Amino acid sequence: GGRLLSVLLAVNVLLLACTLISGGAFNKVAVYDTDVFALLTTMMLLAALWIVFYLLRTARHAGPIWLRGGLVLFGICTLVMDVFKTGYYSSFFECQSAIKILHPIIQAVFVIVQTYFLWISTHLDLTRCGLMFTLATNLAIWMAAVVDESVHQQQGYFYLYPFNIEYSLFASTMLYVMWKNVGRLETFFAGPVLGLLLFVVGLAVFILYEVQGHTRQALVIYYSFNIVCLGLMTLVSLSGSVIYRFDHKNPTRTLDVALLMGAALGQYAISYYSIVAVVVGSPRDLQGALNLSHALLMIAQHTFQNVFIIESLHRGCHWRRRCLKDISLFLLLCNVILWIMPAFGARPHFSNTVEVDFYGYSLWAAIVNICLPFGIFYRMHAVSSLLEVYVLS
Amino acid sequence: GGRLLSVLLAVNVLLLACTLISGGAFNKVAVYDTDVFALLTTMMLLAALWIVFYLLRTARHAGPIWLRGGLVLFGICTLVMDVFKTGYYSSFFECQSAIKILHPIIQAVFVIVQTYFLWISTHLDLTRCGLMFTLATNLAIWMAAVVDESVHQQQGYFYLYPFNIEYSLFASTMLYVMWKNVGRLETFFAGPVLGLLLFVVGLAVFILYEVQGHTRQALVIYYSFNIVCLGLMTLVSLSGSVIYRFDHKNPTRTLDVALLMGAALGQYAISYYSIVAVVVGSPRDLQGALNLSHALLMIAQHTFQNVFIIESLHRGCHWRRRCLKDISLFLLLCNVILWIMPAFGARPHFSNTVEVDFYGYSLWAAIVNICLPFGIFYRMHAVSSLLEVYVLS
C-alpha cells in the first residue's frame, strides 16, 4: 500500500519488459524487434498519457542541479535521432513494418512531454504509481537500447547515436527523485593555466579520433593525454588531501558521498575488465602497457579525487586557501574535459582493440554501454561538488 | 561514514569480484577458474577470519523464522558437497592445481563458521564493515556458482549439486538482516484431505522424474500434477478473497508484503521466459499447450495467493472461520509440495526442452539458477504466512 504499492508495480512491470527484451534478443530461433518496439511504444504511450493527464490536473530535496541540464541535452539528442528516424522510415513503407515508423513518432512525443514534465518539477497514490510506471518505462527503454548496441556486429544518416541510454538514465534518476518527494513534509596561476591547457589538448583529441580503424600515433596520443590528465589529478587530489592533514557539527552529505562512489563504479568496472584483458591477452606490448596504466590511473584518479572532494565538503596561512582554489579549479577543468568522451564518443573506443578481442564485440559493447554512461553522472557531480568546494574554500 | 561506509565497501568489493568472475568466464582467449577459485578462497578466508575474531570478542527484528532452517539445511548440503570434493581431489594431486583442493577445505570451514555465526545471531563500525564484506563474499560466491552451471555444456560422485546458490542466498539475507540491526535502539475435512493427496502425488512425481531424457507419459504426469495443483490454489485462493468481501488500526506488514511479491518475481521471470518460448518456438503441440498453461498458472497462482495472504494478514457465521481453516491449510500443504522442486530438483527441468531449445542450454541454465532459488524463499514465506493466518483465523 501507498509507497510500496507503486514500487511493487514498477518492478513487476520492469521485470515483464526486461524478459521480453532479453528473451526476444538472446534466443536462437530468431531475433524479434518489432515486438520489442511494439512493447516500448505501449509503455511510452501509457507513460505519456499519465503525464499529460497529470499536467492538466496540476497546471491549475530536488536532487542534483546538473540533472536537469543533462536531461534536456540528452533529450534533445534523442529528438534529433527520432526526427531522423521518421524521415528515413517515411520515404519507404512498402518494405518495412508500421511499428518501425510509429515508434519514433511516439518516442519523440514521449521525450518532449517527459522532458517538459521533469523540467517544471492530487491522488498522491495515483501520482506515485504513475511516476513508478514511467520510471520502469525509462529503464525498459534503457535496457532495450543497451541490448541494441550489443547485438550489432535522402538523409541515410544512421550513424546518429541514439542517446537513449543516457536520456533514460537521467530521466529515471529524476523520476525517482520526484517520486521520493511526493507528499513530503585568490589564485596561484598554476592550476587554472594547467587545467585550461589540458582542456584544449583533450578537446582536440576528442574531435580528431573520438567523434567517429586509426593509426598507431593516434592511439598513443589518446593514451598520452589520458595518462597525463589522470596522473595529474591523482597527484593534485592527493596534494589536496595532505593539505587538509596540516590543519564537525554538520551532517554527512550521504547523497553527495553516495553519488561520488556510486557513479564511479562504472569506470571501476571498465578498468577492472580492462586490466584482466591486458594481464591475459595483450602480449606485453606498448598498447598493453598504456592500457594497463590508463586503467590503473582511472582507479587511482577516481579513488583519490573522491577522497579529496568528500573531505572538502564536510569540513566546510593565506597560501592554504589560495592553493586550494587552484587545486579545486584544476580538478574542475580536468573533470569537464574527461566528461565529453563518456558523453559523445563512440562507446567501443578505438583504443579498446585489446578489450574487444578478449571479450568479443558484443560483450564489450554491452559493458561500455552500461558502465560508461554512469561516468557522465560522476563527471557532472564531480564538477558541481568541486564548484561548491572552490566557492566554499 | 558509519552505515554508508560499510555499504560502499561491499559494493566496491562485490563489483571487483563480479568482474573477475564474469571476465574470467565470458572471455574468448581461455576460461579461467583457478584464478576465480583463488579469489573466492581469499574472500572466504578474510570473511571467516573476521567472524572468528568477532566470535571470540563477543562470546564473553530478526527477520523471517524460516531463514535459519534454510541456512542450516543448505549449509549442510554444501558441506557434503565440500566433503566429497576434498575426497576426490585428494586421491590425485599430480594432475590438478593446489587451489582446487584448498578451495573446498576453506569453503567447508567458511560454511561451518558462518552457519554457526548466523545461527546464534564492539566497534559497531568494524562490525558493519565485516558484515558487509561477508555479505559481498556470499554474493560473490553466488555469482560464481550461477556462472558455473551456465558454462557447463573412489567416490567419483560429481553429480552432487553444490547448493552454493541457495546457501549464499540464505546467508546474504541473514547477513543483511543482522547488519541492519547493528546498534538498534474447526475443519471441513475438504482442504486438508485434498492438500495431503496432492502432497503424496507431488512427492512421488519428484522422486520418479525430478531427482535426476525421459518418456512422454512422464512429462505429461509432471504437467498434469502441476496444472492441477496450481489451478486448485488459484481457485482456492480466489475463494478465500471473495469470502473476505462478504464481511484497520494496525500497520502494513511491509516486510511480509515485500517478501511475497519480491520472491515471486523469480517464478514470474521463469513464466515470462517460458511463455515467449512457447508462443514462438514449440509448434502448438501437446507439450507447448501444457507449458503455456503451466506458465500462466504459475503467474495466476502467485498473484492470487499473494492477494489472499496479504489481505488475510492485515485484518487479523461459524462456517466462515471453518472454511478459512481448510483454505489456509490446503494452501499450506500445496505450498510445501511445490517447494521441493525449486529446492532439490535439477535446475534445467527435463520438462524445459522447449525452453532449452529456444534460449540455449547456457542461457536457460543461467535463468533458472538465478530465478528458481528465489522460489524457495517464496514457498517458505508463503507457508509461514499461511501458518500465521491459520493460527489467527
DSSP class per residue in A255-290: HHHHHHHHHHHHHHHHHHHHHHHHHTTS-S-HHHHH
Examine residue B26 and state whether it is found in any structural domain, yes or no.
Answer: yes
* Chain A nearest CA to B358, separation (Å): 6
Test B272 with A23 for CB contact under 8 angstroms.
yes
| Whether the Cβ atoms of residue A219 and residue A351 lie closer than 8 Å to each other | yes
Instruction: Judge: B15–A272 Cβ closer than 8 Å, yes or no.
Output: yes
Residue ending a domain, among B131, B160, B180, is: B180
Tell me how many domains chain A contains.
2
The one-letter amino acid code at B65 reads I
Facing B19 at nearest CB: one of A4, A24, A273: A273
Q: Does A101 touch chain B (CB under 8 A)?
A: no
Reference B269, options B383, B384, B177, B378; nearest CA is B378
Instruction: State whether A252 and B8 contact (CB < 8 Å).
Output: no
Q: How close B112 comes to chain A (CA, Å)?
A: 32
B358: contact with A, CB 8 A cutoff: yes
Give CA torsion, residues A331, A337, A339, A343, to 10 deg: 180
> What is the 8-class DSSP label of residue A51?
H
Tell me the three cell numbers of residue B15.
563489483
Give the integer Cα–Cα distance in Å for B332 and B267: 18
3-state secondary structure B211-241: CCCCCHHHHHHHHHHHHHHHHHHHHHHHHHH
**Same-domain status, B225 and B119:** no
Task: Check CB contact under 8 Å for A268 and B363.
Answer: no
Domain annotation covers residue A129: yes
Out of B180, B202, B231, a domain closes at B180
* Cα–Cα distance measured from residue B341 to residue B372, given in angstroms and rounded to the nearest whole number: 9
Dihedral sign computed on CA atoms, order A352, A356, A362, A364: negative
For residues B196 and B168, membership in a common domain is answered with: no
Same-domain status, A264 and A287: yes
Interface contact A277, partner B, CB < 8 A: yes
Residue A271 to chain B, least CA–CA distance (Å)? 10
- Residues A335 and A250 occupy one common structural domain: yes
Q: At what angle do helices A318-337 and A191-209 cross, to 10 degrees?
A: 0
Inter-CA distances, B178 with B51, B131, B184, Å: 13, 8, 10
Query: Does B23 contact A357 at a Cβ distance shorter than 8 Å?
Result: no
The answer to the question of residue B185 being in a domain is: no
* A151 Cα distance to chain centroid: 20
Distance CA A1, CA B310 (A): 10
Residue A237: phi and psi, rounded to 5, are -65, -40
- Chain A closest CA to B147's CA: distance in Å? 15
Q: Which residue of A lies nearest to B261 if distances are taken between CA atoms?
A: A8
Residue among B29, B272, B363 minimizing CB distance to A358: B29
Q: How far is B117 from chain A (nearest CA, A)?
A: 30
Please give the residue range of the domain that contains residue B383.
191-392
With respect to residue A273, please indicate whether it lies within any of the assigned structural domains. yes
Is there a domain that residue A137 lies in? yes
CA-CA distance, B386 to B236, in Å (whole number)?
A: 13
For this PDB entry, the determination method is cryo-EM
Query: In this structure, what C-alpha cell is assigned to residue A339?
Result: 566528461
Helix (H) or strand (E) holding B350: none
Instruction: Please answer yes or no on whether A19 and B269 come within 8 Å at the CB atom.
Output: yes
Three-class DSSP category at A235: helix
Show Cβ contacts of residue A304 under 8 Å, excluding neighbours closer than 6 positions.
A233, A234, A237, A238, A241
CA distance A341 to A167: 16
Length reported for chain B: 393
A228 and A170 within one domain = no
- Residue B5 C-alpha, separation from nearest chain A C-alpha, in angstroms: 10
Enumerate the H helices of chain B as residue ranges: 3-25, 34-58, 66-91, 99-119, 124-151, 164-180, 191-209, 216-245, 254-279, 286-315, 318-337, 340-344, 353-359, 361-392
Rounded-to-integer distance, Cα B52 and Cα B48, Å: 6
Q: What angle do CA A390, A230, B11 make, to 5 degrees?
A: 85
The partner residue sitting opposite A363, judged by closest CB among B26, B29, B276, is B26
Contacts with B357 from chain A: Cβ below 8 Å:
28
Check B4 against A252: CB less than 8 A apart. Answer: yes
Which residues in chain B are contacts of A358 at CB distance < 8 A? Answer: 27-29
Same domain, B58 and B207: no
Query: Is the CB of residue B19 less than 8 Å away from at least one CB of chain A?
Result: yes
Q: Is A26 on the interface with B (CB under 8 A)?
A: yes
Question: Do residue B72 and residue B208 come from a single domain?
Answer: no
Judge: A23–B254 Cβ closer than 8 Å, yes or no. Answer: no
Instruction: Give one word for A156, left, alpha or beta, with left for phi > 0 and alpha for psi -120 to 50.
Output: left
Residues A296 and A373 sit within 8 Å (Cβ to Cβ): no
Q: Flag whether residue A363 sits within 8 Å of chain B, measured between CB atoms.
A: yes
Which residue, A348, A350, A342, is CA-closest to A362?
A: A348
Q: Which of A27, A314, A361 to mutate to test the interface with B (most CBs of B within 10 A)?
A: A27
Do B225 and B327 belong to one domain?
Answer: yes
Q: Are residues A358 and A388 in the same domain?
A: yes
The dihedral sign for the CA sequence A109, A110, A112, A116:
positive
Helices (H) and strands (E) in chain A, counts: 14, 0
Whole-angstrom Cα distance, residue B210 to residue B344? 8
- The continuous run of DSSP H or E covering A362 comes out as helix A361-392
CA distances from A173 to A58, A66, B330 (A): 22, 12, 44
What is the dihedral sign for C-alpha B266, B267, B270, B272? negative
Say yes or no: A151 contacts chain B, CB-CB below 8 A. no
Q: Are residues A238 and A170 in the same domain?
A: no
B263-281: burial string, b at 16+ Cβ within 10 Å, e else: bbbbbbbbbbbbbbbbeeb
Considering only CB atoms, A26 lies closest to which of B8, B261, B363, namely B363
Q: At what angle do helices A164-180 and A99-119 cross, to 10 degrees?
A: 40
Q: Return all residues near B289 (Cβ < 8 A) that are at least 6 apart.
A: none
Q: Comparing C-alpha atoms, which of B245, B230, B253, B189 is closest to residue B375?
A: B230
Residue partners of B388: CB distance under 8 A and separation at least 6? B313
Reference A149, options A382, A346, A392; nearest CA is: A346
What is the least distance, in Å, from the CA of B291 to any CA of chain A? Answer: 16
- Cα B66 from chain centre: 12
Instruction: Tell me which of A180, A215, A233 is where a domain ends.
Output: A180
**How far is B90 from chain A, CA to nearest CA, in Å?**
30
Q: How many angstroms separate the CA atoms of B130 and A198, rounded? A: 42
- Looking at the structure, do residues A60 and A158 belong to the same domain, yes or no? yes
Tell me whether residue B186 is in a domain: no
Q: How far apart are CA A362 and CA A147, in angstroms?
A: 9
Whether residue B91 is found in the same domain as residue B14: yes
Asked if residue A185 belongs to a domain, the reply is no
* Dihedral of alpha carbons B7, B9, B11, B13, sign: negative
Asked whether B356 and B364 are in contact (CB, 8 A), the reply is: yes
Q: CA-to-CA distance for A148 and A211, rounded, in angstroms?
A: 20
